[PDB]
A paper describes a structure:
CaMKII has a unique architecture, in which the catalytic domains are linked flexibly to a hub domain, also called the association domain, which forms a dodecameric or tetradecameric assembly. We reported recently that the activation of CaMKII-α by ATP and Ca2+/CaM triggers the exchange of activated subunits between different holoenzyme assemblies. Our data are consistent with the idea that the CaM-binding element induces the hub to transition from a closed-ring form to a ring-opened lock-washer configuration, which can release or capture dimer units.
The N-terminal α helix of the CaMKII-B hub is preceded by a 12-residue segment of the variable linker, including several acidic residues. The acidic sidechains in this segment are located close to the acidic residues in the hub. Comparison of the N. vectensis CaMKII-B hub at pH 4.2 with that of tetradecameric or dodecameric hubs shows that the linker peptide cannot be accommodated within the grooves of the closed-ring forms without steric clashes. The assembly is distorted at each interface in a systematic way throughout. This leads to the formation of a spiral, similar to a “lock-washer”, with a slight opening between the A-B and M-N dimers (subunit notation is indicated in Figure 6D). The segment that is bound at the interfacial grooves in the ruptured N. vectensis structure is not the CaM-binding element, which was not part of the crystallization construct. Instead it is the C-terminal portion of the linker, which is presumably accommodated due to the low pH of crystallization.
Residue numbers in the entry:
A (entry chain F), L (entry chain F): 331 to 473
B (entry chain E), K (entry chain E): 331 to 403, 409 to 474
C (entry chain D), N (entry chain D): 333 to 402, 408 to 473
D (entry chain C), M (entry chain C): 332 to 403, 409 to 473
E (entry chain B), G (entry chain G), H (entry chain G), J (entry chain B): 332 to 403, 408 to 473
F (entry chain A), I (entry chain A): 332 to 403, 408 to 472
């Protein structure tokens, strides 16, 4: 029970930019649904990462995140609702792209408590042999 | 006194990504020296930014950072493990750990750490920083 | 049940309807009836609420998440100010006072300041924007 | 005192663009403490929801004029303005206001508020008849 | 479920005394959670200032009714130094210190104190409470 | 010192309009600390519930005169939603929310909210305040 | 549970000795929760100052009768240095330090302290407690 | 600085009115730090219960005379609801709530509260305070 | 229950040796909670300063008997540096440090230190404790 | 620099009274920081239990002398309910509650309370303090 | 489930120091699996150690760590930026950041970080860990 | 006003081990005296480090520490007394050595307050062309 | 219960080596709660400084025998033993004791104490006449 | 000045000298006279003190650091136990109670438990080990 929502606003993006947004949406769907095959198809095997689970280190490879796919609750236990706020997409020539957005996640905590979480995400995509892959992402949370 | 040091340890970088590292070094130099002219020369005027000064929002433009070049009142900035991924011919992405050694109220030494991602785009033959993302992890 | 408090007087016939429409809206919220809610709310509604964490959200899905989760409550509208905007605009602002039961068997009262902006689209009034605040 | 709008890379229609410009002039009169321009842009019977009102709804200019008369480097930034038009005489603009300033010490601090302003075209001119300021925790 | 009124020394006038009686009946309907007597003693458009209203002024019975619908035997209220000021033939203003005794979660005796001002209006020969103000000092 | 009153809606009767005006003059006399005007508007044996009384009920004018003589510049009192209920011909009861904008120890503006209930009694053709009740939430 | 007086030095007169014995019987009815014995020794219009009154002065038997109808074992109350001043034949005033030893929630022995001042009035040949004042030092 | 009494309702007898006036003169000598006027109104062997005694009962004038020789402007003491009970011709007992308004370290106005119980004895035609008890509620 | 005594150095006179022995028997009667032995060793009008008295000075046996009847297995009392000073022929004063090893609520051993001063008076040829003073640092 | 002793009611025997006097002189030498009078009233091999000794027993004058060498006008001590028990012809044991009043860093009046037990021995016809025990409750 | 991952990013190691990394991986595996036989095979019996379990003291021998192999009651250990400096023919020194992903009381995920230095000595043709130094920096 | 003291105990070390101890002493003397030339002579220009000033990162090169030589108070202001506790030296063939010890430092704080600091140090030495150099050190502090 | 000594890579003289072995036997009797071996290795008039004594100096075996009689996986490690001999009948051994154990939960905890034991050769056998246990903060 | 407290009795002539030597040692400490201190203390003295942070230190330099830094104090020795060890050993243990003035003008008292071990080296007694503890 999870669905990903984007809201660009009145602004209409480039068709290319629109595809980067759609791909990012698919990736987030892989993460919330914990489908590691779909995640792996969209992400480069040598992706560098900056996330709070890294404790200020930079991590490389898929295994660090495959830990979260193979573990953590399945997804049946609870329901989630992620939302992408103001996605800014900057194309970098023909083979690069950089999408940065605010991620707002609605869910249920330990009890039947509804809570909202905000994180700031930067994802860099590289067009490798006609296929866009996520080569680096950087996820922070405000204090 | 403001100096900037990179630490590539044993790995070897290509000339392109070595230049991305060099440009990032100059950028952070203009930051620590509060030289906004050089900073403006290295940064695209429509630059997006994620930083703790923005309170979890994404800001655009130069005025938001030019505020800090003004108004604000001996440090060593160190770039740790610069990962530079080239993106075709007009893209580049360098992520690193920014370690800052400095002085407190007294002659007291303290170190701060932030994780930075900077995205460079080659616009009309020159490299410009079009987006950066600065984080500080659970202190 | 919901209680309105105009204090004194009767509003004009146009803004009285805005008050009643707000009553039906809050009724759909408290009763968790999403059909009436979707009928009263524009599909591209912008929103400022504490559940949005200082962000502005748009669409119904963000709010429909709250309809699909979770008996006796008493909401009360304090000093409604309705300002009409031509023939196709209306802006109602009021203080929402809610009475309910928390985790234990103890009664609690919550206060929030709500500002709803209604638009008359093709003869029917729809809420296109609302702004919910909570004082500290 | 400099004010910057951030539409994203979008262009609004000619009608709502003026709502954006007028809002910038309003925030300008607020930051510069110029009550004359403020009074020209605001209806005298303006209802208001702001943290200075302590969860109450205030009306009139006197409550706000109290703030123009006290105290003499700031940078306000308008994040994601949404303008929904209401016929020919109504407009509703909502945005996130991001303020950079200097506090008691010489330290830069940033504050974020959410603002929703409702404008009414009264006799060919636009006046701000309602506004709602919230602050996230 | 017994309410004690403490006139201190000396005796007031009879008309003030009846206002005191009606206030007692009101608080009895409150501690006994008897909404019928409460509705008999209270005007349907009563204004109220109480800590449950969060610095707002509430009107009507539903705001207090809600409280009567939800709760359940052991209470004791005491009216401290009631001042009753008559207002012509149709007005009355009684103000007093309310002292309530009860039992919380665990079996320990606790006492709460509030300051109350109740305003009675003589409508059609009967007295009704048209406004009350409940405060608590820190 | 400015005392502003706002009724959300409706016109009061003439009598209760006067009750509102008399309350306004009273609050003015408090802010200006003119004890002669205050005493003219208030009964010499007025009972009172206010935070300065520490949950006690005080009577008389001296308890309040103490504040008139020792306090001893610019403040803004706003009166929100006055509910006036007349009691026959010789009684009246007005209850309202009071907002106070002022400057504290700093150069920073602060707002204070209190809920007030005043009871007026007409004696010999003159309305006097005989009891008031001020609480803060 | 039993109560113990501590006269320390010197011997009191035959009048004040009875005041101390009656105070002992009173506190005995308090610790044993026997309201009958308490009502025989207390005037029905008794004023009271106690921490359970929150700095107010309550009147009547019911304010204290609420406490008799709550909780059931072993306690030890001691009257430290009773000072009895007689006022003619119909007045008496005894002030003392009440020291209580008991068990709380856990299994521990403790010693609470309160200062009590009781005023006795001889009404129709019997001594009655018309006012008591309970204090606690910080 | 001046002291104000609040009799509220009713009129006291001619005897107890003098007890209240003498209490006013006493607290006046306290707030003005005039030990001469204080010594004229207080018996030299006065017992005392006050928070400055830490729950003990002190005797003599010097224990309080220490406070007269310390600190120098504007204060306001009010006697709330004085209850005076006469004991023949040579005894009197007044209990009241003392409410003090003053300025602390910073420039702020405040209202401290203490409960006072004073016992007056007529010794050779003059009334003297032989025992006072100062309490503070928490 | 074991009561151990240790003098760092020196031999006491015969009298003060007996004073030490009587104190030992007293502490034994407290630990074993044998009130008959305690009463035999203590004056019926004994004054006392102990933490159980809350800074007051208590007199008599009942105050202490309360603890004999309600407490109601293995503890180790060690008496450190007894200073005995005889006062003529009918007085004596012994002061010492008392260590107590025991088991509290847990299965963990805890040690308690208290400083005690006992005053013995010989009445009719029998030594009785007439005053003791127990403090804890 | 004045010490007040409070015998409460009634009068003790003369021999106990002199022990009280000598205790007063001792504490005067303490508050006045007069080491000569202190040395005249105290045996050179005095044992002591005081909070300054940290749960240890100290002996001799140097431990208290040290205190007399270092410090400087405003103090007031009061001896509460002195119990004096004579021990034959050469022993005496006085125990009491000491109540001290003074001024700390800022100009605020403060009161401290300690429990003291002093043991006097009649050595060569004069009384000397051979052991004292200073305690403070929490 | 216990796995161990190294992250050499772009740099290239020699076969010797690559084997030092491999041996360290096996060592940490025997730690997370609490397999003391393998651990003893990789560790010299007179090994010195600095670790927070030692409270600022330096311990020697195996019994101090064998205590933790006993008595103690799904994790991913990751070796970050392994710097391996060879010391002639019989010495080696590998220092790295040890990042540990694991589960709390609930199915709650948490990450811990420690900095480790391990010194290897070639004794009779086999490599043994003769000294290690484990630190945890200002959490 | 600073001097470095070693105390091996009754145990006598190897002559080689003794030299490693002496070299370590010289290095610490360079640090306390803030003589960067003497420090640089004993330390390898590509030394890796683990110290609390690195915030859980590993640092390489001299500049990170030359920051502390060129800044910080000179050394004239106060007096220091460092002490090396139980130095354990393990030789690694002919070209490696590993010395680990407890560092106890006595000094004066902000006021005239004497304070003691303990840190645990591991220093690795490499014999490069007949000259021992410090190639890695690891300094921790107990909690 | 296993005990490990850590001389560093040194060998003591034959006389002090026995002091080390005997100390190991003493700590063995302590960890195993075997009072018989303890009493054979310890002089009956042993003075003692330990945190269980609350800064006081205790003497005898009873104070320590109290601890052998209460409670039934531990690892003690002796760090840097210094043995200074005193003629033919005295010896002073001081060391750092490092203890690994399990607390209330199933969590491993480590404690560190500093111990100084003074042995005396009494009639050809070595007895521990004094010990001093400290704990750093 | 320093005060000894044998409580009662006189020690034997051999251990009395150990007590006096301890007095001279503490005198050199309080007066910060390092010459007498070095004369009374063996150059290879082991030490357990709170200034060593749970470590055992050896030598005079660690203590000489404290002689070269920083009027009226009163130290007192409580219940000294002196146990002789043959002809060339002695072990004295005692409670040290120190009276002094802190930062302000207020008197403070500190307590520590000291255990000194003396050795007769070539006819003269030297302190070869001492162990200073502080109770919490």
């Amino acid at each position: 029970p999870h669905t990903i929502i984007e809201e660009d606003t009145e602004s209409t993006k480039t068709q290319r930019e629109q595809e980067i947004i759609r791909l990012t949406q698919q990736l987030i769907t892989s993460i919330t649904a914990k489908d590691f095959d779909s995640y792996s198809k969209l992400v480069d095997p040598k992706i560098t990462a900056f996330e709070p689970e890294a404790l200020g280190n930079q991590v490389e490879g898929l295994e660090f995140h495959k830990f979260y796919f193979d573990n953590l609750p399945n997804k049946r236990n609870t329901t989630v609702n992620t939302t992408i706020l103001a996605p800014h997409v900057q194309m970098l020539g023909e083979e690069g792209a950089c999408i940065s957005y605010v991620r707002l996640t609605q869910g249920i905590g330990p009890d039947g408590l509804p809570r909202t979480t905000q994180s700031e995400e930067t994802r860099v995509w590289q067009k490798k042999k006609g296929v866009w892959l996520n080569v680096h992402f950087h996820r922070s949370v405000s204090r």
